[PDB]
């Protein structure tokens, strides 16, 4: 039933068998996204990369219950601290690292939110974050080596939070795809 994903592909089909109810079994979901080896030419496609900051690229809008995408950082790119909108937010390295930094929802005073803890996030692992486990800032500290991870969110949503570091207020983004199935979103 839970079988070893050989390909993207292969993957892909198993997430839609996952989300095929109404609920999600977040450490299958987990399992099955750390257990598909990263082969670099089945998502050279999505791998479109931007100069001046991390680029999102849709690959599978799912059966309505999720989105599939693969995010593209250069070096020294990275994210706000965010929220992840009420949804389950899965994030697999298929290449390079990231520095994932925790913070805890900040309270309704002005204060500097200071990090609950960080890690790094090495080639193939699968991080998971939700709501009520904290926000989180995402980075390629890297100065040498490009990263690209594989997230996949469910429910899909296309807005989040920004916050500042220094005081804990939020302001409402719209994301953006910077590309779709391949090909390229202006
Ligand atoms: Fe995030």
Same mark, same amino acid.
């Given at each position: 039933?839970?079988?070893?994903?050989?390909?993207?592909?292969?993957?892909?089909?198993?997430?839609?068998?996952?989300?095929?109810?109404? =609920?999600?079994? &977040? =450490?299958?979901?987990?399992?099955?996204?750390?257990?598909?080896?990263?082969?670099?030419?089945?998502?050279? $496609?999505?791998?479109?990369?931007?100069?001046?900051?991390?680029?999102?690229?849709? &690959?599978?809008?799912?059966? *309505?219950?999720?989105?599939?995408?693969?995010?593209?950082?250069?070096?020294?790119?990275?994210?706000?601290?965010?929220?992840?909108?009420?949804?389950?937010?899965? $994030?697999?390295l $298929?290449?390079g690292n990231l520095?994932?930094?925790?913070?805890?929802?900040?309270?309704?005073?002005?204060?500097?939110?200071?990090?609950?803890?960080?890690?790094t996030l090495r080639?193939?692992?699968?991080?998971?974050?939700?709501?009520?486990?904290?926000?989180?800032?995402?980075?390629?500290?890297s100065?040498?080596?490009?990263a &690209?991870?594989?997230? $996949?969110?469910?429910?899909?949503?296309?807005?989040?939070?920004?916050?500042?570091?220094?005081?804990?207020?939020?302001?409402?983004?719209?994301?953006?795809?910077?590309?779709?199935? *391949?090909?390229?979103?202006?």
């Amino acid at each position: 039933e839970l079988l070893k994903p050989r390909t993207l592909a292969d993957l892909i089909r198993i997430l839609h068998e996952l989300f095929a109810g109404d =609920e999600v079994n &977040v =450490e299958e979901v987990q399992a099955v996204l750390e257990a598909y080896e990263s082969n670099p030419a089945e998502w050279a $496609l999505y791998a479109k990369f931007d100069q001046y900051r991390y680029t999102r690229n849709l &690959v599978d809008q799912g059966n *309505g219950k999720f989105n599939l995408m693969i995010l593209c950082w250069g070096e020294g790119h990275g994210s706000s601290i965010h929220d992840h909108t009420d949804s389950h937010c899965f $994030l697999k390295l $298929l290449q390079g690292n990231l520095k994932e930094t925790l913070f805890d929802w900040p309270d309704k005073k002005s204060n500097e939110m200071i990090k609950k803890s960080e890690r790094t996030l090495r080639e193939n692992q699968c991080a998971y974050i939700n709501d009520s486990i904290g926000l989180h800032r995402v980075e390629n500290v890297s100065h040498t080596e490009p990263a &690209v991870s594989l997230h $996949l969110y469910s429910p899909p949503f296309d807005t989040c939070h920004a916050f500042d570091q220094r005081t804990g207020h939020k302001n409402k983004v719209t994301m953006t795809f910077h590309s779709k199935f *391949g090909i390229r979103t202006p």
